[PDB]
């Protein structure tokens, strides 16, 4: 008939956050459950109305619908700083193939209201390529746009087990390109792949490959908008770095012979990978490792800006460059815990870059689960 | 953590 729940949570990116829902099972009869959620963390405020699905068709076509609101704030996810608000819709039909695969293809409309951005050289960039022109040396601004996307989607799951997986492989392909009409032109792909591949026969022993990849850029002139770059370095991409370091770093105008800093931006295009040595815990019983789970692991990865000019600020790194492949190694920590599914790593950041910034321990408390 | 509560 229904049901709700409640979240609570921490992570060292994140801060602590909170989670909470509520969901009718079948509204009036019609197969589809309604629901709301919402969810808010250092950076983030997050909320949706969700219908969904199944069995839009009988054959196990679903439908996913969501209508949000999102507020983003840059300087809290450690980004130089922007605000972003936003809202729109979005519906997804959902196609299963096989037991291993399924396509989705879905349409989007996006409102995104960009105000109390920092004067830096990228985002103006963007700015100027949108036919944008705010002041440099002030940070009352203001960009609206409305954008229509054509979302579709791929994901080849074969892991034996959801959770602490020990063999097997899980791929993850997403695209979306605005549709004509849009304000923005762009288009974005992300690729994610995780394989699990056992070296021993009680599987207490696995090798585990993680990649990530991600590229956009716009079109006919425009520029992908600085707000869907990518991002790396963090509890969840690159360990041992603090949460989004890896990549460009805004290049600041003066306000009222630009500025060098430290201050992560992300980039259009961007690479990550992991691999990661999974092992029985010490002191702990191996009857836990579907609960608990050790790891050593090398990371790497990189971030960049491919429309960076360089002829124009030759004085600065050329943050167009995809060869500074930042790199870490360490060893992490899964329990699910009573307090909810729980990672804690320590890495060292052996491979780094000016201005880049280190976060050895790392620390995460699901609220979902 | 996460509570659910069907109702
Ligand atoms: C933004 C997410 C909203 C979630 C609200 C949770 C509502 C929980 O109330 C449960 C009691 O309902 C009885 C009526
Ligand atoms: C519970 C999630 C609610 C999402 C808010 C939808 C915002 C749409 O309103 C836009 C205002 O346009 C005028
Ligand atoms: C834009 C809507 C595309 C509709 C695709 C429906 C294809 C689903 O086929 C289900 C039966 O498969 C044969
Ligand atoms: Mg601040
Ligand atoms: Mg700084």
Known sequence: ?369 | WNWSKSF
Not at chain 1, 210 to 229: A, I, Q
């Open chain 1, 1 to 369: 008939t229904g049901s709700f729940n409640f979240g609570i949570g921490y992570g060292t990116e994140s801060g602590v956050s909170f989670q909470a829902g509520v969901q009718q099972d079948n509204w009036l009869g019609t197969g589809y459950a309604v629901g709301i959620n919402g969810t808010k963390n250092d950076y983030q405020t997050y909320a949706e109305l969700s219908v969904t699905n199944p069995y839009f068709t009988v054959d196990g076509v679903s439908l996913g619908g969501r209508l949000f609101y999102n507020d983003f704030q840059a300087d809290d996810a450690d980004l130089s700083d922007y605000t972003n608000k936003s809202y729109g819709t979005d519906v997804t039909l959902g196609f299963p193939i096989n037991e291993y695969n399924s396509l989705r293809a879905g349409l989007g409309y996006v409102h995104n209201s960009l105000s109390n951005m920092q004067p830096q050289v990228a985002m103006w960039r963007y700015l100027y390529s949108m036919g944008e022109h705010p002041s440099t040396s002030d940070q009352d601004n203001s960009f609206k746009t409305d954008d229509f996307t054509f979302n579709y989607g791929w994901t080849y799951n074969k892991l034996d087990r959801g959770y602490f997986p020990t063999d097997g492989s899980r791929v993850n392909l997403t695209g979306k390109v605005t549709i004509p009409g849009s304000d923005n032109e762009y288009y974005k792909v992300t690729l994610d792949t995780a394989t699990y591949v056992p070296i021993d026969d009680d599987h207490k022993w696995v090798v585990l490959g993680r990649t990530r990849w991600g590229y956009g850029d716009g079109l006919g002139g425009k520029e992908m908008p600085f707000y869907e770059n990518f991002y790396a370095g963090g509890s969840s991409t690159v360990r041992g770095f603090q949460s989004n370091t890896i990549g460009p770093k805004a290049v600041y105008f003066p306000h009222q012979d630009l500025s060098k800093s430290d201050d992560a931006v992300g980039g259009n295009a961007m690479a990550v990978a992991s691999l990661e040595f999974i092992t029985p815990t010490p002191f702990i019983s191996d009857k836990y490792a579907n609960s608990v789970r050790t790891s050593f692991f090398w990371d790497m990865g990189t971030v960049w800006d491919t429309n960076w000019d360089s002829s124009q600020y030759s004085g600065y790194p050329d943050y167009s460059d995809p060869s500074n492949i930042r790199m870490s190694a360490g060893i992490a920590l899964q329990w699910m815990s009573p307090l909810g599914p729980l990672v804690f790593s320590y890495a060292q950041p052996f491979k780094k870059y000016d201005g880049d910034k280190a976060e050895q321990f790392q620390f995460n408390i699901g609220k979902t689960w």
